Design a protein around this ligand. Sequence first.
Ligand SMILES: NC(=O)c1ccc[n+]([C@@H]2O[C@H](COP(=O)([O-])OP(=O)(O)OC[C@H]3O[C@@H](n4cnc5c(N)ncnc54)[C@H](O)[C@@H]3O)[C@@H](O)[C@H]2O)c1
Ligand SMILES: NC(=O)c1ccc[n+]([C@@H]2O[C@H](COP(=O)([O-])OP(=O)(O)OC[C@H]3O[C@@H](n4cnc5c(N)ncnc54)[C@H](O)[C@@H]3O)[C@@H](O)[C@H]2O)c1
Lengths: 283, 283
Amino acid sequence: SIRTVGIVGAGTMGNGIAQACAVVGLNVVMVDISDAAVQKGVATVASSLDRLIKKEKLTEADKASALARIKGSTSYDDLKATDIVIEAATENYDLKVKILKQIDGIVGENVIIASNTSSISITKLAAVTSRADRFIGMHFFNPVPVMALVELIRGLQTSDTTHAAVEALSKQLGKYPITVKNSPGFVVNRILCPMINEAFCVLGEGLASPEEIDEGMKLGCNHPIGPLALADMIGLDTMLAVMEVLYTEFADPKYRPAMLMREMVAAGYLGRKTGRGVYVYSK
Amino acid sequence: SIRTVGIVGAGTMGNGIAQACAVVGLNVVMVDISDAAVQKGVATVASSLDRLIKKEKLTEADKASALARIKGSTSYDDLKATDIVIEAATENYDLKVKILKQIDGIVGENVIIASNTSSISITKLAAVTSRADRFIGMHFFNPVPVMALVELIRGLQTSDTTHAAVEALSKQLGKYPITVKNSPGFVVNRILCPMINEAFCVLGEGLASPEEIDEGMKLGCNHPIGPLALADMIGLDTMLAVMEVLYTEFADPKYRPAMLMREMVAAGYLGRKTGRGVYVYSK
Ligand SMILES: NC(=O)c1ccc[n+]([C@@H]2O[C@H](COP(=O)([O-])OP(=O)(O)OC[C@H]3O[C@@H](n4cnc5c(N)ncnc54)[C@H](O)[C@@H]3O)[C@@H](O)[C@H]2O)c1
Ligand SMILES: NC(=O)c1ccc[n+]([C@@H]2O[C@H](COP(=O)([O-])OP(=O)(O)OC[C@H]3O[C@@H](n4cnc5c(N)ncnc54)[C@H](O)[C@@H]3O)[C@@H](O)[C@H]2O)c1
């Protein structure tokens, strides 16, 4: 049984997960490095909950009822309390390793250790823990409370039992889990991101205007957002880096980053987060 | 002014266009090779119109009012009547050429000749007519009455005037036109179809189940349909052929068809149209 979920990292993704567990009545032990980071974690869960109140989504008593289940710590031994720990602090490799080893040292042999990540090899991480068969990848989606799926990524070592447990936890949290063998871009980024890249290739070659490329794809394929606009939301620096990973990990030019993508990144035109990428934004 | 539109071909796409012109009060001269094909063209416009009646979309009098404007011929000299002729009979090259030359012979020098096509080089076709600057590509979308966009594809020769006229005609028909320099896959198929191909690559490599790949993309990127399901609707034979065109026309393995795609095609598992492709269907 998994009634208590360890969480390391209390940022966007961390509360994300904590909330998702808590509104289901699971006990979360959320760990960060200050008291500032922890409570600030608790503020966005409160604020988010307060938004749900205000559009007739259940309810005042549950807002209260979820939060009680969140034990927000700063010491790391609190995770002996826990059925499973999810790391969710960093896309930095060396740092990620450290965190997982520290986690590996505290919790008992049979506890499952997961790591949220978009790009990092789940197999390589699993190998740094003393029980690799108890390790598995998760990838949650970027507004976590509402987004109804998770990629569950098996390292080469991830056992079937580790898999079914997390698979069930995910279904519990009310998400549809997707199982994927560890592979660059897993499933989602693997197919989506080279499409974004092809849009840049089209824009790069002068074939059409951006706006028209984007309308092409909205109206033609009934995509909610156009790939260029979407790139501007994700971050072209985030896009370029995914493509560089595909190209490096596969060692195959099929995944060349688009050149215009490289140029915008070099220039600092990174999308909405700098006010300019493919399109210009208001600031 | 463009008040009378030539149409060669009275199949799915042909009526498609005719209707779209007629419900706007444009005079269509629709030409096919039998009287069977012509009237059968007129039947699907009637049937489609009768569906619109039945969901409170205007109206009995307009159903009547559109049809009057459709002059359905079988002789080819009827197209001297016309401001512009759109070919819409065939994706066969040699045949396409013939039709356009025949059309080129009838109509006057200043009449615009277009060709609907997903894959055929608009430049190469424009070159077979005596006035290439009066030639342009269209690509309409596959349920034409409702689909609100057209790709407008300039051959190297297409003049600006030819372009603006058709651009305006398109806006008239109530569609958003997309302008594209002639290039394999234009814009839409160029970015969409290699994404479908990447899904097959993922399925091909054993990374995930189809259903999960498809859910990955629906829920993750809010795509209406999943790429594999979509491939099953388009036809895997139609998919493979688009990829083969990309690979052949660019002469670049970046667009390798996925191997699983090749195998399903070789096997006859072509999607919904044979009852089996990626998934199995009821027949
Ligand atoms: N946000 C995204 O774009 C995104 C998308 C998919 C996956 N991810 C994954 O999730 C991770 C977390 O991203 P986020 O959006 O929550 O970041 P964020 O900037 O919102 O917050 C990161 C949090 O991690 C904490 N942290 C850093 N080092 C730590 C340590 N040694 N121990 C405990 N906590 C530590 C920080 O104090 C901070 O509160 C990413 O690094 C990435 O691996 C992120
Ligand atoms: N349907 C699609 O999947 C699709 C999608 C995009 C573009 N297109 C383009 O549009 C073309 C038409 O496809 P469709 O779906 O209307 O086909 P269809 O099978 O519904 O009908 C084709 C029609 O063209 C007519 N035709 C054939 N040869 C002719 C000639 N020499 N003169 C006059 N008419 C002739 C036939 O009699 C028939 O009525 C395709 O070949 C392709 O170039 C098709």
